Design a protein around this ligand. Structure first.
Ligand code: HEC
Ligand code: HEC
Ligand code: HEC
Ligand code: HEC
Ligand code: HEC
Ligand code: HEC
Ligand code: HEC
Ligand code: HEC
Ligand code: HEC
Ligand code: HEC
Ligand code: HEC
Ligand code: HEC
Ligand code: HEC
Ligand SMILES: [Ca+2]
Ligand SMILES: [Ca+2]
Ligand SMILES: [Ca+2]
Lengths: 495, 495, 495
């Protein structure tokens, strides 16, 4: 009786008819349909957002997403340790909530539990039931975590958590969140995050990347659609002054973007980008930017060489550095913006070919693994599958040589940023002019933007070695110029 | 003729009769017995303290203790290197002898040679015969080391060595050391350490943990007995307002503690504790505390959250920090005090189940390995033996995740301690009030106590992850409070 | 017709007749011989310097030199990273070109391409054709690199490259370089390095260590011959007041040194030494030392305990430290001077026994591998071949224990150098006397000389553990003495 439904749901008919999902009865994914027919539109069907329904017919994708693996080096790797990805984090991000805890990423199945449990999220309120011995448990959020309650305190935590955070950890609010988190849905940007978390039972849904109605490759992330719509000819995913995205707006309430061809650069860019999803400060007037402002659910889709101008253009910065008071941008995991225009991107390779390589399940049916892969741990399938002349050692050597050269420049950029910050403090105590301190703040802004992008980004340059070198040497140059003018100004005081 | 002996040695009769050692002739372990009978009590039998006698009937325990293994990452691992367990050691312990050399522990068979050869012991006087190529040799101290003599100098060494040090490296002085090292035995706390070392041929004896007379599980360490006796109802080993320890006092000269049931927490706490075994300074008057003082052979049996109050209560600190002049506690390897009240302790698991797992020897007789094990190197026997559902990768993941999270907080506590020390120095040079510097010293004391415990402790939180988090975040909080008040006081000067 | 040639080339006759190469026709290695005979000496034969000619009869040496191996940890390892061999490089070498890039060494076949491509060589002018994916290519320089041209800029590079650099990367200029690079050959010390690089097609030739005429073990490096000639009785290679080197001077233009017996300490010392091959400054007058000066192609052949006196004696230093203005020596890879007088040197072991171990080729003919080996990666052939009682773990344990103890002192020397530099800067800002700052500069000179030798040297003490300890503790002592007098002078100012 789908034609009954299709009478008032025309877009679903468009997606589903003559699709690979054509035959699937509406009842497979929607409950209370009879009540919706019999009692009218006031009584909504139930749409349970649930990987297990997709798994009933796609077991290898479902099984590989939920498969539990144990990295013998462990997880919860703080980045701000000496041998870590961001060893000078505590000094360079002084005054930012990331100083409370920032760990390396792990598997997709953990993404909700790790967002809720991190020391920077909600003052330690959410914890693993049974603690560390259950840290590898997957499945339903509230089977895994407990709520210690609103009045509990945990020392050296922060309260960075907000509803927009959840948009990059789950598909559970797809029908309960108006476009951009503007008011009108069950939840919006101004919601109490502790109401929102109760609604999040699952990590990123199968529906995040795949239309349930027709199985079309798609995106559902509001900020990513908004970015592509703002710059449809020149954005990082465009080709020929066009992007492969048809936006479907349901009821003026929620958008999807459907693509004719798989583009995992867009599918993964739903989360693996720089974003603003937090309050901040305007550069002009020093006024707060609150969750009322659309800038608190924002995808720039700009790379390291563009972001400082981009955030100046939209009159926004994240935090003042606790020492220099520089109006700093906080960068997060810009993998899509890094990958854009790199050797592999230009070759037509997409994120999924390295990170979701082909494996065989079960009997021996071929599928894309949905347990996303760390290519250095799987070079036969992530690399040699395409680079057939490569030995495993050659693949590892190529990854690690690029990471080696890039990290050399990252560490040198940190040395110089640390020097800039320490010299600034000395310049302050030597009563150097606030005019000249302001010049140094600008150099800190620039050096910071060209450095922090790369500790935030997860490849240590592999995704774009040229951009990483140009950015990080630009950071070093800016810091050296700041240190020179501060040390010059310090001579001129006592001259 | 044991009844002859038993006439004047009543306690030995109590331990030996109806024991597992009942049948063993006194002559097996004591020489010159006839002269002792014939010439009377003036001529003492010879009691050679020697693992090889125990080995004659317990070959697998003896063989596994002396087995030579080569860790391919080497030994003599200085902790104060960037990638090391205590990377900011040289700054945070400035003014302490540990800045001359402090390496990670290795195997028990090396414990005397490594105490005598470390650069902080006795000005480099003791060295390996033939140098590095013999660094893996086990057996008799003076087959392995040479004495360069009292007048030899070795640059960048220290003279921390003292007789009480030897009490945690050998059973060789069991009959030659009056309780607590008070005067009356061949050696006491005031002895020249260079006389004492000549008497130490073996590492920790079989008799350290096992009664030779009846084979009862026991302790012989004077400071550990003294601690248990001071607090017999509430100490970390107690249960039901009682400790499983019967103290036997021989001649008012030397004590053992015998337990009805194996408690390796007590057996290992003979050495794996925080201790004071060194001169120090009183907090009240600034007067020396010398080896005449019982506080120089002292076991607090207190954890990270208790030690600062404990050392304030007994009016003792180890060193003034070379920069801040904070009256600091020097912490050493508090494994027993950490382990106390942890998940595994509460489950009735003891040190030996993870560190002396069951292995098969020879033919295939089952025994507890007496080559103590680093569980991460042996997860099948140290972990999976009990956690039967664990894979080796799961065991490794669980150890390393806890170490990862704990080290993140350890490194952050060091960052903030370094900031506190650097800010203090700036506050001094900005002529901030000595009143306010004194407030900052108190914050350094607190931050130091809540940090250094964990670099001194060897598990990086595994033994008590909750206590480690509470302590290390407390350290960070104290340092941040010190940095705030110093930076506030620095504004107020030039206000 | 060799007797025709031998008439005017008497030294070649001496080397070639009754040699292992006796039978080889001159035409095998020299072209245009008929024109040289027919047209006279004005028309020089062509002498193509080329491993492939040697390879025609020595395939296993040729094949093993050019064999491509992929270290899975990658290459281009910057030393100035936290976990790196020289973690405080950027601070301690501040004002030296090594701060732009200094990576660990890799295989011999890469030595030209890596010299030309390093960020410190020639402003990034030379790059790998096709970039990173060709970083493992071996063979001809200009098949592997491209020239971006003289006007191209690459941010955060330096221009350290000069002709004398090439003398330790290739045998290609053996007939085109007058002794010491004095004027008269196609190239000299004053040549434009960008003319010189065009002439360098190959890495170190077979002829670097082996005479082509008679196959005698030899050296061709001008600076090494000059050093041995200056001190023929007491130099590090001497025995019995004599060195095994007969110098043959061709035309007063170019020297070789031929040895009766293989001495790989000399063969490898052609490059694995400290050297001066750069402009610098005189200590006395502050005058430049230019490529006109013989001190710009100089081998001291002195160890860590001798170099500071050595460079003071010849009135030379490399750079003023950017903070302290200390007149610092820049140290490079002093492996031969370190190895001299070590346990293995005294035992008659040479570099080649550990680094060119015996392997079997082809069928199974035994040869010395000419792919030089990192012994920790090959302990069966580099170590156990001679230490037959060693297990692989024992060999690794011995290497890594020595490296562990040595690195502990290296890291501690860096901590104290960093403290010296930071204290100096504070002493300057507290207006401490320039007299007392000059005293501290001397302590920085000394501490620097006794430290940087060991980050420059590649064994982390393995080659001479006693010398490393004596040097690095001497560094620590010098820095502590500098920090004491600066901190004392700072009290005395405000006294
Ligand atoms: C017109 C008379 C309708 C027929 C026939 C069916 N549906 Fe419907 N549906 C209709 C309206 C006007 C609305 C919602 C209006 C609003 O914005 O609240 C709905 C809603 C749904 C939803 C809910 C989406 C959400 O916000 O959670 C679902 C999943 C849905 N409808 C499914 C559906 C099916 C499967 C039908 C045939 C059995 C069907 N609808 C008939 C209008 C009408
Ligand atoms: C938002 C819903 C996401 C989308 C869409 C994708 N990723 Fe992701 N990823 C995300 C998070 C929040 C995490 C961390 C989870 C945690 O609990 O820490 C990650 C992690 C990865 C990793 C690391 C995997 C691991 O270490 O085991 C990789 C390699 C990764 N992500 C890649 C990736 C690719 C290629 C995507 C498109 C196919 C993709 N992600 C989508 C959030 C989201
Ligand atoms: C999409 C644009 C995102 C928004 C909005 C937020 N997060 Fe995120 N998160 C995202 C990705 C792709 C990843 C994996 C890659 C990485 O660099 O981590 C993550 C990871 C986390 C993690 C795990 C790692 C860590 O930082 O400890 C946490 C704890 C996490 N994210 C929390 C978080 C919070 C609290 C947010 C709102 C302030 C938030 N995320 C927004 C993608 C996106
Ligand atoms: C092969 C050419 C790749 C493509 C295309 C993309 N990625 Fe990648 N990624 C690659 C490597 C070699 C590495 C280094 C670390 C490693 O595991 O080898 C990375 C790193 C990441 C990470 C960090 C997690 C990890 O896998 O270790 C993330 C989160 C990641 N990459 C995501 C990502 C996205 C979203 C991509 C398309 C925009 C992308 N990668 C492309 C190799 C390749
Ligand atoms: C009473 C007449 C004795 C008989 C019979 C035996 N022993 Fe004895 N023993 C006795 C005294 C009074 C002392 C020492 C007094 C003092 O404090 O110095 C001893 C000493 C020993 C020791 C020495 C312990 C030490 O300090 O090193 C040993 C090992 C010992 N005695 C053993 C022993 C044995 C095996 C006997 C039967 C053969 C024996 N004793 C008889 C008193 C008497
Ligand atoms: C080895 C297995 C032993 C046998 C058999 C016996 N004794 Fe022993 N004894 C032994 C050791 C290693 C020591 C040192 C202290 C310790 O507790 O480990 C001793 C000590 C004694 C002492 C001294 C007690 C004191 O007064 O302080 C006596 C008096 C003694 N041993 C007597 C003794 C007798 C009489 C035995 C036969 C019945 C006998 N011992 C057996 C080791 C061993
Ligand atoms: C004092 C006599 C000790 C007793 C009793 C125990 N241990 Fe110990 N341990 C001690 C020292 C002095 C050393 C270092 C030795 C050196 O030369 O460096 C150690 C070392 C260990 C180690 C590390 C083992 C290794 O790295 O190979 C472990 C795991 C260890 N110790 C555990 C341990 C346990 C479980 C004990 C009770 C059974 C125990 N120790 C007793 C000193 C002493
Ligand atoms: C028991 C309460 C002890 C006293 C008293 C002393 N040491 Fe110790 N030591 C002890 C243990 C359990 C261990 C292994 C665990 C660890 O954290 O090291 C050690 C180890 C050493 C080592 C090896 C490691 C190192 O620090 O380089 C040395 C060199 C050592 N101990 C020396 C030493 C000295 C000189 C003492 C008196 C000042 C001393 N120890 C006392 C247990 C105990
Ligand atoms: C299993 C539940 C354990 C019990 C009970 C105890 N220890 Fe432990 N210890 C454990 C782990 C997983 C680690 C981390 C390092 C590792 O090797 O895996 C440790 C560490 C130590 C160390 C450092 C040496 C080492 O083994 O690497 C010491 C010296 C040590 N532990 C001693 C010790 C003592 C005395 C215990 C009872 C109080 C104790 N451990 C209990 C696992 C477990
Ligand atoms: C004397 C009449 C000669 C006979 C017969 C041969 N050679 Fe010669 N050769 C001679 C002179 C005077 C010179 C060079 C003078 C100068 O310094 O320029 C040469 C040069 C060579 C070289 C060049 C070395 C260089 O600088 O590149 C080679 C390789 C050489 N000669 C080889 C050679 C051979 C193989 C001969 C027999 C066929 C031969 N020479 C004959 C003088 C005379
Ligand atoms: C100058 C012509 C050289 C001579 C003669 C020798 N070596 Fe060398 N070596 C040299 C350079 C310039 C490099 C670095 C090359 C690069 O592209 O980075 C090296 C490297 C080595 C290494 C490291 C090998 C590797 O990592 O794979 C070793 C162990 C080494 N060299 C040893 C060595 C020995 C033993 C020699 C005499 C037989 C020797 N080298 C000669 C420059 C030169
Ligand atoms: C012989 C006395 C040498 C002179 C003159 C120069 N180099 Fe060198 N170089 C030499 C050796 C034996 C090695 C390998 C050992 C090591 O410690 O690196 C090297 C290595 C390099 C490398 C690779 C490693 C690195 O530093 O990044 C480069 C890029 C290199 N050398 C460049 C270089 C330049 C530019 C020189 C003139 C200023 C130069 N070298 C001189 C031996 C010798
Ligand atoms: C065995 C007794 C050796 C002799 C003789 C020499 N070297 Fe060595 N070298 C040795 C070890 C164990 C190490 C440590 C790093 C390792 O790979 O194990 C080294 C290190 C080097 C290096 C650094 C590159 C490397 O191999 O990792 C160089 C460039 C090197 N050594 C050169 C060298 C020269 C020129 C020697 C004679 C003067 C020399 N080595 C002797 C072991 C031994
Ligand atoms: Ca951001
Ligand atoms: Ca202590
Ligand atoms: Ca030099």
């Amino acid at each position: 009786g789908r034609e009954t439904c299709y009478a008032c749901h025309t877009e679903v008919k468009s997606l589903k008819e003559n699709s690979k999902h054509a035959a699937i009865a509406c009842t497979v994914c929607h409950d209370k349909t009879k009540e919706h027919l019999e009692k009218g539109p006031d009584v909504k069907p139930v749409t349970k957002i649930d990987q297990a329904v997709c798994g009933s017919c796609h077991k290898n994708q479902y099984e590989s997403f939920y498969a539990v693996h144990h990295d013998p080096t462990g997880a919860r790797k703080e980045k701000g340790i000496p041998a870590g990805r961001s060893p000078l984090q505590d000094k360079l991000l002084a005054g930012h909530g990331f100083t409370f805890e920032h760990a390396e990423p792990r598997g997709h199945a953990y993404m909700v539990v790790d967002q809720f449990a991190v020391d920077r999220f909600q003052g330690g309120r959410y914890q693993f039931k049974g603690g560390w011995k259950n840290y590898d448990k997957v499945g339903k959020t509230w089977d895994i975590l407990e709520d210690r309650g609103p009045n509990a305190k945990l020392p050296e935590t922060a309260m960075a958590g907000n509803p927009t955070c959840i948009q990059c950890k789950s598909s559970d609010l797809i029908l309960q969140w108006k476009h951009l988190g503007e008011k009108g849905g069950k939840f919006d940007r101004t919601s109490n995050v502790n109401d929102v978390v109760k609604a999040i039972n699952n990590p990123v849904g199968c529906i995040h990347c795949h239309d349930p109605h027709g199985a079309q490759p798609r995106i559902v992330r509001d900020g990513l659609i908004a970015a592509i719509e703002k710059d449809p000819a020149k954005n990082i995913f465009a080709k020929n002054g066009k992007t492969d995205l048809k936006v479907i707006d349901f009821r003026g309430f929620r958008k999807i973007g459907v693509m004719e061809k798989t583009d995992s650069r867009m599918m993964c860019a739903q989360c693996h980008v720089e974003y603003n999803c937090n309050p901040g400060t305007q550069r002009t007037d020093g006024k707060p930017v609150t969750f009322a402002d659309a800038r608190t659910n924002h995808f720039p889709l700009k790379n390291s060489l563009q972001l400082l101008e981009h955030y100046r253009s939209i009159d926004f910065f994240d935090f003042k550095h606790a020492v220099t008071g520089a109006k700093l941008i906080k960068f997060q995991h810009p993998e899509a913006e890094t990958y854009a225009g790199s050797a592999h991107d230009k070759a037509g390779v997409q994120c999924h070919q390295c990170h979701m390589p082909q494996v065989k399940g079960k009997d021996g049916k071929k599928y894309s693994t949905h347990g996303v892969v760390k290519p250095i741990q799987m070079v036969q399938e992530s690399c040699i599958s395409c680079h057939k002349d490569y030995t495993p050692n050659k693949a590892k050597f190529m990854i690690e040589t690029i990471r080696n050269y890039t990290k050399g420049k990252m560490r040198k950029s940190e040395y110089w940023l640390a020097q800039l910050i320490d010299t600034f403090a000395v310049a302050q105590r030597e009563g150097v002019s606030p005019t000249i301190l302001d010049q140094a703040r600008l150099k800190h802004e620039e050096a910071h933007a060209l450095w922090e992008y790369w500790t935030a980004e997860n490849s240590d340059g592999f995704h774009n070695p040229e951009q990483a070198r140009q950015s990080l040497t630009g950071s070093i140059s800016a810091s050296k110029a700041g240190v020179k003018l501060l040390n010059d100004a310090i001579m001129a005081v006592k001259q």
